[PDB]
């Protein structure tokens, strides 16, 4: 196990919530797939602080607020799926574009 | 010899500007008849 | 009539492909972010070739 | 070393002032927490004038700058929620919602907006970045029960959160191509090879940097969060949150890559030939008021990024005066667009018609700020372009200056479609307010803070360019550091 | 041009979008002529 | 001297014009704004004759009214006002007609607190296009006129007021842009940054750089002074105004973009002038031939003369590309007199409209036989068109074709087909001004006088603003030298300062 | 599928041809102790900013999922109908 193998996982762990941002239409596998995005980049940056630089580790440092932020990104993002099927009584992302043009 | 600008605009710029005063006082057709009104080209 | 319908025509031509140029791009934006997130993704691969060379 | 960050500690507190007091006095505490939010932004906006003469020191272990270009941003951050409390003093008490609630999530934008400006590490960049971002999203749906703010405060979500992860994985990439090193000066020193991981790294931290300040390829989140947002959300972010993009772009393409340099004033010229044709052809198919002033928004943010990609002393110094000017624009026009969504339902264009004998304060307010979003003489936005110009003269860039004076002509058109329906129009040709204005009052909740932020508003639109020359000084110091 | 053919000595019959055209390129024509012989002919 | 006199002249107006929604006693109509607007409007042309018939000081090449105030160190632009030449003549024929406009605005009562605003806005604005010795400023003042005189015509106007606006709003300042371009151009060339007009004309310019400079300010001055490709916004802009806006529109507004092909374009681009005269003149002749049988060809009357200023301002274009001290001489008469003929003539249209109400002039015949000093002022200003001698309309034309061919600039068979084809419109004119004054007030056959045009008669108030405009009219036509004795020292150097270029 | 397949030829050919610096050092000397040394001496300013974003999203993510059942045919006031949660600018068409 070498860093090029930590990065290549998460270069594609980051490229599989990419294609589940565009793909899902289901509004919270949309936010499921951020949060596979939101690991994609602590993959790529502890890798990143336990092969460079890991006698004063920065990246797990900065590895925990990207867990706090996607921690409260969730939550903020959940109220935002419960605020919409209370007035829009389904959970679908091809029904919401109501504001086309 | 030539007749310069400076000394008759000097004389006939109060004479200019009292007969403004006055004519306006003095005017017909803008307020008895009156026909366009308040838009003054439609 | 050369006057009010050629030399006229084309300031009325400058105005006219850019009000339907606005009416083109308007249909750029059609709601469902899946799409709005897809023209993010594909830019960021375009300025990774364009900058490269 | 805790002195440098003062402006925004003094928001801390009294952002858990009117906190404690929505639950200890219960929507009672309406009437005064606005106005102790005002002194507590008023109190932050003049502890910034003793750190003015300070010479740049570098606080909290190399974490936080107190230059004179952190503290002229923290300035317009706390400028934009000073003008926005003073709107949504009734906008927000008229939904039924709570007003304590409301000034919450919108001074923790103010204070993440506002430590953007300082910031020079990686981790407080994104933290900074984040609660901006994630405090945005909750005011953009904040009335909750419309299906037009619920889709915009999604479509914000799920943009937002995903362009904060493109953020992430460049700037996780600069902690890697680096030897550690968080910080954007130790970045620096590091990395000047130009290779291909510092592109990448450069393209991905661009798609978030470059989302605050809605460039065309990553703008497509505004006009539909503008319309369905609150419109002192739609206010907030289209000069607070707009300017901490702003404020982070010159702070760290600068900072993190003064090696790589002619690669991402490449692109953000493509940035801004985009979103000056597109944030001003687009806004001319608009009918929605809060609409026309989104794709302006896009547009007004390619003249800004006209002095950014030029790289001089001026250059520099010409998107800092036009920013300082925009929230005088941007706040005067927002201003009257809820001063009439606030008597009259439905504010959109062609129904503004038959104006200026009902309303001639919100016609002279809306005019002079539309005016000037047009820069016609002698107003501030006027002045704001002549110096985005003449510094876009100064060092090459012949087509992106001529480019935008072309569309500041197309700008004028959409402008001035505004003028038309308010003033042009006679009284046989309005549609809503045909004899239904509700004869306006200035003794109403609320309103006297939304008059005052018109009147000086407009003031600061109407004589900021003839009276610059302070302000050029004010902003030609902001300047000398930055590399 | 039915405004421009009002009851007066105008409206001769030549209005139609053919003749617009075969007007434009010997008016137009004479202008540029003129303008290509001015940088020639004057010095 | 010491006291500053054309930044207040520029800057009493604009002041003045905040008064104007503090008036009191808005009892109906707006009576004592019109009397404020008037009262501000003579007393700020006292101030233009107080500072020229005590400190102008002519005969004299140069500023004499330079006040250089400093205003952004950081850009380089100040406040740097004078009059030298080709501004003071302009300067006080602005301060002349703007007074009459605010008197010819009497009959306005739609909206009267935003009419005597705009019209002061543009009385502040418009002396500042000639008086400021500067790039970024005379740039804020020329489109200084660009938002008053959108709402001049959008508010008070004919019909397809709203089509004539906003092709005008997009014509201008579309062109405008090219000042800046040209602007900025001219004052980064070398090493020093000043954006005044004095060290930009004293500055040395490449030849191939100074031929986009030429075609910038051609494009853009092209637009105002109305030459025939760039031309079609005027007839719309021009044909729907009512009588006191287009005082401004074709007296004043035309005269900045003739003033500044003299200042901007010979004096500081001597080289590029030399190289591009002979289409000017090109241009100059095919803009009379051009405007005056489409003047012919049309029937509403205010589209009629409206098309007439534009066949007078090609009289400018053969006297500035014609190198001569006459020939100048006649390019700046042509501009002061046009102005004077053309506020009068355009005066009279929406005093002829004010009791018809139809401008077709077909339904028009024997308006003559019901009033009759309108038909008295009517003809007497459309003679004044004519370059009839014994008014300023002849010798502005006659100076031109004397000025023209005996210039030693062009050739002998390029002389004299200018001059023939010049000509053509001392025989054009007459053919649709007198038809036009047949066609209305000529004849037996009047209207049907019980629908449309139930009124008829004659305000001493519209006789006095004929008979003071027709003073400088007839006055410079019985002694020209009475107007070029301000301008004979400073036309002297703007022709000798191209005399050093010409062998090219 | 295609720009997912596109950043992933993107990223591997960035990861394999980036030289990276690694340090052959011991790591994590009890990696417990030199992350809390690091929430208050370089990353202080962080952590204090993570508490006014939580408290944030507790203040916003309540008041965007509870339920209106203090008065939801609430009437406040009224220049023109405003309907009580939702923005005054109401929908219509052009």
Request: hydrophobic share 30%; no cysteine; proline share 8%.
């Given at each position: 196990m070498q860093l090029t193998y930590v990065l290549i996982l998460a270069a594609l762990l980051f490229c599989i919530g990419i294609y589940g941002l565009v793909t899902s239409r289901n509004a919270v596998r949309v936010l499921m797939s951020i949060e596979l995005l939101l690991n994609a980049v602590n993959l790529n940056l502890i890798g990143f602080a336990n092969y460079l630089d890991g006698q004063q580790i920065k990246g797990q440092v900065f590895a925990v607020f990207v867990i706090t932020v996607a921690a409260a990104e969730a939550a903020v993002g959940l109220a935002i799926i419960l605020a919409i099927y209370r007035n829009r009584d389904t959970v679908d992302m091809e029904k919401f574009n109501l504001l086309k043009w | 010899a030539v007749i310069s600008v400076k000394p008759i605009l000097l004389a006939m710029t109060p004479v200019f500007i009292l007969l403004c005063l006055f004519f306006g006082t003095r005017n017909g057709f803008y307020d008895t008849d009156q026909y366009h009104g308040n838009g003054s080209a439609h | 009539e050369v006057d009010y319908n050629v030399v006229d025509g084309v300031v009325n031509l400058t105005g006219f492909v850019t009000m339907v140029t606005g009416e083109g791009l308007?249909?750029?934006?059609?709601?469902?972010a899946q799409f709005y997130a897809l023209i993010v993704l594909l830019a960021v691969l375009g300025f990774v070739i364009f900058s490269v060379q | 070393n805790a002195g440098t960050i003062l402006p925004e500690t003094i928001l801390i507190v009294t952002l858990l002032v009117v906190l404690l007091a929505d639950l200890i006095q219960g929507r009672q505490a309406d009437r005064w927490t606005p106005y102790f939010a005002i002194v507590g932004l008023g109190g932050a906006i003049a502890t910034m004038i003793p750190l003015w003469t300070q010479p740049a020191t570098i606080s909290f272990f190399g974490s936080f700058i107190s230059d004179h270009l952190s503290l002229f941003f923290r300035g317009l951050i706390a400028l934009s929620a000073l003008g926005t409390i003073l709107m949504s003093i009734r906008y927000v008490e008229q939904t039924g919602s709570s007003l304590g609630e409301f000034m919450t999530i919108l001074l923790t934008a103010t204070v993440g907006g506002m430590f953007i400006a300082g910031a020079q590490e990686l981790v407080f960049i994104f933290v900074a970045l984040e609660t901006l971002s994630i405090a945005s999203y909750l005011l953009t749906g904040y009335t909750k029960r419309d299906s037009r703010s619920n889709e915009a405060a999604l479509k914000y979500l799920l943009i937002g959160a995903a362009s904060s992860a493109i953020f992430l994985y460049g700037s996780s990439l600069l902690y890697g191509l680096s030897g550690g090193h968080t910080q954007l000066p130790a970045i620096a020193q590091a990395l000047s090879s130009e290779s291909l991981g510092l592109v990448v790294a450069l393209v991905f931290v661009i798609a978030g940097i470059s989302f605050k300040i809605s460039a065309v390829p990553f703008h497509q989140w505004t006009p539909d969060v503008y319309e369905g947002a609150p419109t002192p959300v739609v206010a907030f972010l289209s000069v607070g949150s707009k300017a901490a993009g702003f404020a982070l772009a010159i702070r760290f393409l600068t900072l993190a890559f003064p090696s790589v340099t002619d690669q991402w004033q490449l692109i953000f010229t493509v940035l801004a030939i985009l979103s000056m044709i597109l944030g001003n052809v687009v806004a001319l198919a608009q009918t929605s008021m809060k609409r026309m002033l989104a794709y302006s928004s896009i547009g007004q943010a390619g003249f800004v990024m006209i002095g950014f990609v030029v790289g001089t002393e001026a250059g520099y110094a010409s998107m800092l005066f036009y920013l300082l000017v925009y929230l005088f624009m941007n706040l005067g026009a927002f201003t009257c667009v809820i001063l009439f969504s606030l008597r009259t339902g439905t504010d959109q264009i062609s129904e503004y018609a038959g104006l200026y004998q009902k309303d001639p304060l919100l016609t002279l307010g809306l005019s002079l700020c539309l005016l000037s979003l047009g820069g016609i003489p002698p107003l501030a936005g006027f002045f704001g372009k002549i110096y985005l110009f003449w510094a876009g003269w100064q060092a090459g860039a012949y087509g992106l200056v001529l480019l935008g004076l072309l569309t500041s002509v197309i700008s004028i058109y959409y402008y001035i479609r505004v003028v038309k329906m308010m003033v042009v129009k006679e009284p046989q040709e309005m549609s809503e307010a045909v004899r239904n204005y509700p004869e306006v009052s200035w003794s109403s909740f609320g309103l006297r803070p939304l008059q005052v932020g018109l009147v000086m508003t407009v003031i600061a639109t109407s004589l900021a360019g003839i009276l610059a020359n302070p302000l050029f000084n004010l902003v030609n110091t902001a300047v000398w550091d930055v590399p | 041009a039915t405004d421009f053919n009002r009851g007066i000595m105008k409206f001769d019959g030549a209005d139609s979008p053919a003749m617009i055209a075969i007007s434009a390129v010997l008016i137009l024509g004479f202008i540029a002529g003129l303008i290509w012989w001015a940088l020639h002919t004057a010095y | 001297s010491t006291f500053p006199w054309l930044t207040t002249i520029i800057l009493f107006p604009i002041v003045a014009a905040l008064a104007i929604p503090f008036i009191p006693d808005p009892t109906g109509k707006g009576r004592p704004i019109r009397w404020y607007a008037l009262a501000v409007g003579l007393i700020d042309f006292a101030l233009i004759v107080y500072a020229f018939t005590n400190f102008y000081d002519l005969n004299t090449p140069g500023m004499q009214l330079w006040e250089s105030y400093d205003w952004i160190p950081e850009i380089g632009l100040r406040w740097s006002v004078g009059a030298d030449g080709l501004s003071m003549p302009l300067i006080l024929l602005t301060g002349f007609i703007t007074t009459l406009a605010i008197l010819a605005a009497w009959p306005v009562t739609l909206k009267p607190r935003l009419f005597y605003f705009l019209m002061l806005a543009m009385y502040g604005g418009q002396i500042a296009v000639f008086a400021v010795q500067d790039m970024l400023v005379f740039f804020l003042a020329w489109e200084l006129e660009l938002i008053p005189v959108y709402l001049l015509l959008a508010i008070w106007g004919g019909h397809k007021r709203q089509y004539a606006a906003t092709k005008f709003i997009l014509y201008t300042a579309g062109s405008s842009l090219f000042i800046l371009v040209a602007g900025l151009a001219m004052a980064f060339y070398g090493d020093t940054v000043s954006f005044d007009m004095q060290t930009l004309a004293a500055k040395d310019y490449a030849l191939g750089f100074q031929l986009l400079v030429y075609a910038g300010f051609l494009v853009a001055y092209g637009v105002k002074l109305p030459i025939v490709p760039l031309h079609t916004w005027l007839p719309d802009a021009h044909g729907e105004a009512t009588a006191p806006v287009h005082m401004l529109l074709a007296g004043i507004l035309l005269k900045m973009g003739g003033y500044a092909l003299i200042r901007?374009?010979?004096?500081?681009?001597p080289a590029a002038h030399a190289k591009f005269a002979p289409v000017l003149v090109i241009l100059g002749v095919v803009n009379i031939i051009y405007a005056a049988l489409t003047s012919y060809a049309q029937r509403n009357l205010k589209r009629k003369i409206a098309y007439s200023s534009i066949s007078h301002i090609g009289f400018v274009l053969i006297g500035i590309a014609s190198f001569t001290n006459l020939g100048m001489s006649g390019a700046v008469l042509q501009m002061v007199s046009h102005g004077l003929i053309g506020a009068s003539l355009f005066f009279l249209v929406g005093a002829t409209y004010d009791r018809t109400h139809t401008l077709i002039l077909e339904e028009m015949g024997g308006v003559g036989q019901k009033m009759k000093k309108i038909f008295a002022m009517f003809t007497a200003c459309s003679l004044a068109s004519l370059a009839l001698p014994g008014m300023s309309g002849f010798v502005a034309e006659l100076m031109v074709f004397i000025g023209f061919a005996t210039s030693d600039a062009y050739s002998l068979p390029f002389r004299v087909i200018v001059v023939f084809l010049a000509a053509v419109g001392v025989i054009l004119t007459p053919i649709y001004l007198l038809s036009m004054l047949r066609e209305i007030?000529?004849?037996?056959?009047?209207?049907?006088l019980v629908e449309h045009e139930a009124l008829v008669d004659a305000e001493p108030r519209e006789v006095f603003i004929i008979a003071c405009l027709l003073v400088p009219i007839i006055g410079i036509g019985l002694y020209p030298k009475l107007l070029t004795q301000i301008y004979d020292a400073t036309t002297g150097q703007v022709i000798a300062r191209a005399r050093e270029v010409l062998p090219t | 599928a295609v720009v997912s397949l596109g950043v992933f030829a993107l990223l591997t050919k960035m990861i394999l041809q980036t030289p990276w610096q690694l340090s052959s050092v011991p790591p994590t000397p009890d990696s417990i102790t030199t992350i809390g040394q690091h929430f208050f001496s370089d990353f202080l300013l962080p952590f204090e900013l993570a508490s006014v974003l939580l408290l944030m999203a507790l203040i916003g993510a309540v008041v965007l999922a509870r339920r209106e059942l203090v008065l939801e045919p609430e009437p406040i006031l009224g220049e023109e109908v405003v309907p009580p949660?939702?923005?005054?600018?109401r929908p219509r068409e052009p």
């Open positions: - | - | 308007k249909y750029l934006q059609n709601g469902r | - | - | 901007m374009n010979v004096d500081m681009l007030f000529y004849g037996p056959e009047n209207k049907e | 949660l939702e923005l005054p600018e």
